[PDB]
């Protein structure tokens, strides 16, 4: 007698995942959504270099500390990259005033070019090649940072210096200036003629009057003596305005400098890579639609959502063992090569497999649904996590810390359990498909066969390989073979 | 061939909405839980108007900027509403000491009234009436801001002024006042005898000097001299103290203030509606019990959650085609009207609709519960966001930024798929329900019935329609008619 | 004549659950995992006590406030204990700068040592035992701090200190010091010879002046004078200069600093309990593997989430009313007692019950294990959650503020969501075992038993008790009983 079986795919794989209810469970095709891989280069961001201070500090870099030792100036960078504590950074020491502030806002730059604001020429009572020191050596020769002008006394007279300079260009000007704390009485009357002196610096917003500190320091790359710098960005058609009668560190040059996006600096000493990323961590870039990963937290640009995780897999294909599946249908077919869900027929033409096309297709098409919906719903806009906050920030620094790790935490457990839970409900559906396979086919036969108890049909009649695949393709006439499955549903013993 | 089915209702909706695994499924009913809706207006905030300060900023507001309003009698308020650049804030340039947490101090104020504290008769050996600016004009001509005092020099002599007063009120006090640095000093000995001078200020916290720096600075309304002024809260029974011989911005009128709570400065052209609401936007107030919106980030009040989405449809109704629902029951019954689950008779009498009355209010319960569950399980509280960091912030605006977009990712995206969700498990617990509904069915009549295998019965008997609706309220006697069936069943094979 | 029926197991438990469907359903087991409890103590966290300050503040504590005990007893602590006011704190009324952030770096030190290191005979030159005020009382007598010394003139003359200490220790080193700023020239004088007077401070990174600010101010503690006090961390082989004609409150003891983590200030008046803890709330420890906790915000530790909630009970057994569970079998079995679902049979040899022990045993361990992955799923890191932002920080705080608030939205939506959304799926798995059970039954036993529409066969031959258990392991031979029972079923019908 010919009989029809109702089966689901089986094969080789070995991959597992967890269920809300199940650990380890083996099926035949799963999908990690978490990202790990990275590239372990520094990229280009969206078609931008980054700035990269190989060997300076942003704040050498910018004074022109004659120490550092390469400065081929780029006109945009998308971020910065610093390593860990460069070695050349203030030669002579002292300070850079709202240092991180200035360093967050040259993060991203949409243009940046050095132009001369001030010459030397500008101070013909002024000594203006002797503010020299021995802390900021250029090829074995004492010197100065080059940006700025260390104006020293001439003919042992320091004249009250009043100087303006009107913003000409259309663009905004950083520009940077300094006071020196000398150490003694005897050093201040030796480099300026004054004993009691002061900077003042105005614009239309500013209005800051410096006096030096002439007191007992600690010694600092061979110096007691301090240099505390300041910034401002002066707006087109605005004039900054400079009178002193000593310790002016005069600007000499300044940057006009265009701003548009915002970004951070990053600690780096990964190398650059000819590459372009849309999302980069200090370890390399990543290139992914994944809406997890846990690579780095300190990452720049549209990254997916940093968890702590290992693996992040969901289960597409079926519970696989290289009520249904596994349950009155007593186990999977390796012999079914072809598709998720379909039949096993036997008549005296032959034996074969065959998959249902249009059930395995609407799974398949419900299971990538379901992935490409995890993945595609995730909201994912550009970010920049560094850590920009000084030695006396720690509270705001701590408040940071919180954000992110609640952020990660909230993360975390969202996405293992939504895994655990549509992994189950995936496992599921396969049984609730297979299940209405067979009761489509119960359907199409009725007592033209008879239930054999484990997802087979027997027929009460001969079942030609037409009849096979018309029960396959919904096609089955019951009607016709009624009398056939009739004569011999009576003549059964027994 | 009489014939009992089981079916659905259906109607002519068009509604749509997703699942985890199913896209653009159209239903017969559905709810957006997504706010998109405001009324275009500024409103009160539960019960409390605004302070709208019309092209005034809190700075020229406060201080008495004389093109600012004088006759603004708002006593209590609860949030202010600036315009995104106002135009009368500090007429004479300079600056207001620690403005941004000022505003944020003086966002929802419980009381707020002006008095007079130190009156111009306090002031016998000094001018009181000259200063005055073109800087700052009152009807083109010049003038001065009216709650604070520009003492002259009198008969070319400028006493050390020693002044106090003690908060006699029951309230805090609000007292403001500045310090002037002129240009040079020719203004410094024309405006006040004395070349250098000073402002000391001393409450019980308050521990102030200010002395003037008289540099060059650009032109600003007209004026290279600047203004700076501070503010304090002086708590009742302690005594302010002023002492100075120049420069001295002197207060004339404070402020007493109520303070039971915060808020935030709303930026927004929009204008007032004489309106309600427990929810305030730039663009329009929110009047929602929803859990989401997509109106605006900017709110004040108890607003539902903020996501990036444009809608969050969830189905309540059923699959509707204008293993159950278009598995075996070919399709929806539009003759049936009166409930979600039911039957479909046909014999010599005629034939009908009936619905299975308990489990169609057992689903109607669910659902309505499953709605109300996704709704009233989330927590509203009060907050009020705004923009009130200053230029030299952008590290703590790029953290409250980074939490700001955090949070619309985690909502946008458990919102986004707690719908997907909650909707697929809806529709199978409709599929569920009309196979429970074909087997109840199925085990009251057991073998005094047949299967026809497409949603429908054949009875083994004819059964009234007093037996139907036995078969129906749940008593059908099988004992009862089970050999008039079993006698007719042994009769149609056929 | 002889049956066997499917059933489930019941009790007669009165707990209940609610489902994103159904409200208020009892089940037979049912299980709390938000923490509640708290042992109403503060404990050492992760064995290391608290350094707790009775009465005094951080400043009172670190200057030595004569009422303050040197707190030198602890050596190492994992977070400071404060009252909500100290009663003693500066006693000498001013400022102690950056105080908050030197509580923050205070929160949790690793050692912790007060030394010696200027002692009084450093001073032969000024008097050292004069510095005494009401304000600083010690057994009623007048007093001062006992760590920092107020030099006063002496034999009417106060000649110019110059002192340096290195930092010899090979740990950090916290100091402090201090100005006096007095109340006229007369007690300038008075105090200190000199009338115009200046404190320097400098180190590698330190560069301070200080004048005093000699001016008329409110009584606070019986004085106008007020003290400003500031703090350095001096590194190891770094070395700390001072200079100063007058007013110069000069420190005498400093503090050996390891840090290794970092905490905050908890304020509580609840006593220290010997106990060791996790997670510290200012009311009580909590010693929970729970995810979720509704004690307090401001914890320390490793804690669950912070919700918003009364209970969050998840069911873990059966629905209990003392589609299968009331779909065609009736109701639960409270005879059955070793299992969750299972058999009642009856042939000549007798009733009984009997646990299907399969299905129970996965469906047990499927349910601890989903527990077990809502708990273990948790990501618990260290937190600590203070209010560190003083008076003129309130922007901050609330960013502060809704950061924590968004994490309590967040938080509390999700864990309500998903016990409502799992006690749902746990009920419907319950049912489907139920029915999966019952289908094993009935495709074993096929025509060689009557279904009975409640749950029970109906068997058409004799069935003894091996043939019951063999029903019930789910090898029931049914070509043994087939013949028997066809004829028997052509007997009864009939
Ligand atoms: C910095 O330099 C610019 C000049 O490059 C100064 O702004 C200039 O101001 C003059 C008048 O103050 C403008 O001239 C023209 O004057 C007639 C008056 O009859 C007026 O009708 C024109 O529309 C225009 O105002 C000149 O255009 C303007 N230049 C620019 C580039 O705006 C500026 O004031 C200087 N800043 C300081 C602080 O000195
Ligand atoms: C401000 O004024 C009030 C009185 O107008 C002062 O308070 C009084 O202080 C004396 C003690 O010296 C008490 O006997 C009175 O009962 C107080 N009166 C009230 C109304 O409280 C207060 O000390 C003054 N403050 C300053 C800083 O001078
Ligand atoms: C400050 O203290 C440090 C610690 O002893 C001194 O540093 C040592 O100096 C001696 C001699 O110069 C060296 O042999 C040691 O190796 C140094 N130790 C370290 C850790 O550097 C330092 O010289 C002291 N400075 C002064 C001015 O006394
Ligand atoms: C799951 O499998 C891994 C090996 O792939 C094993 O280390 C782990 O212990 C297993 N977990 C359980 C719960 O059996
Ligand atoms: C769903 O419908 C919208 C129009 O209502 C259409 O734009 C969209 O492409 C549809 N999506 C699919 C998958 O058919
Ligand atoms: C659930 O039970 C509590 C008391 O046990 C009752 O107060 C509450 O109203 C009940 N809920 C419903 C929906 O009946």
Known sequence: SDQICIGYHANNSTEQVDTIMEKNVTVTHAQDILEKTHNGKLCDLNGVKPLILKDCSVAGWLLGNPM?????????????????????????????????????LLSRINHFEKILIIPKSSWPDHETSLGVSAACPYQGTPSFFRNVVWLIKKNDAYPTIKISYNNTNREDLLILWGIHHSNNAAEQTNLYKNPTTYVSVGTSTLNQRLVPKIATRSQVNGQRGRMDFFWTILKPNDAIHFESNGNFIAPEYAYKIVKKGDSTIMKSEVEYGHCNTKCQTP???????????????LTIGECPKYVKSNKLVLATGLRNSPGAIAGFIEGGWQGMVDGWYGYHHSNEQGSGYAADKESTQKAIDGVTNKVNSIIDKMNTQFEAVGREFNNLERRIENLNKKMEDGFLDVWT???????????????????????????????????????????????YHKCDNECMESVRNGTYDYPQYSEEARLKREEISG
Request: aromatic share 12%; hydrophobic share 35%; proline share 5%.
């Open 68 to 104: 550092c030792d390469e400065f081929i100036r780029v006109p945009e960078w998308s971020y910065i990259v610093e390593r860990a504590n460069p070695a050349n950074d203030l030669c002579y020491p002292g300070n850079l005033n709202d240092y991180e502030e200035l360093k967050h």
């Open 283 to 297: 370890i390399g870039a990543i290139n992914s639609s994944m809406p997890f990963h846990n690579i780095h937290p």
């Open 413 to 459: 457990y969202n996405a293992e359990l939504l895994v655990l839970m549509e992994n189950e409900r995936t496992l599921d559906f396969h049984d609730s498909n297979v299940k209405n396979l067979y009761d489509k086919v119960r359907l199409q036969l009725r007592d033209n066969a008879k239930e054999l108890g484990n997802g087979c049909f027997e027929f």
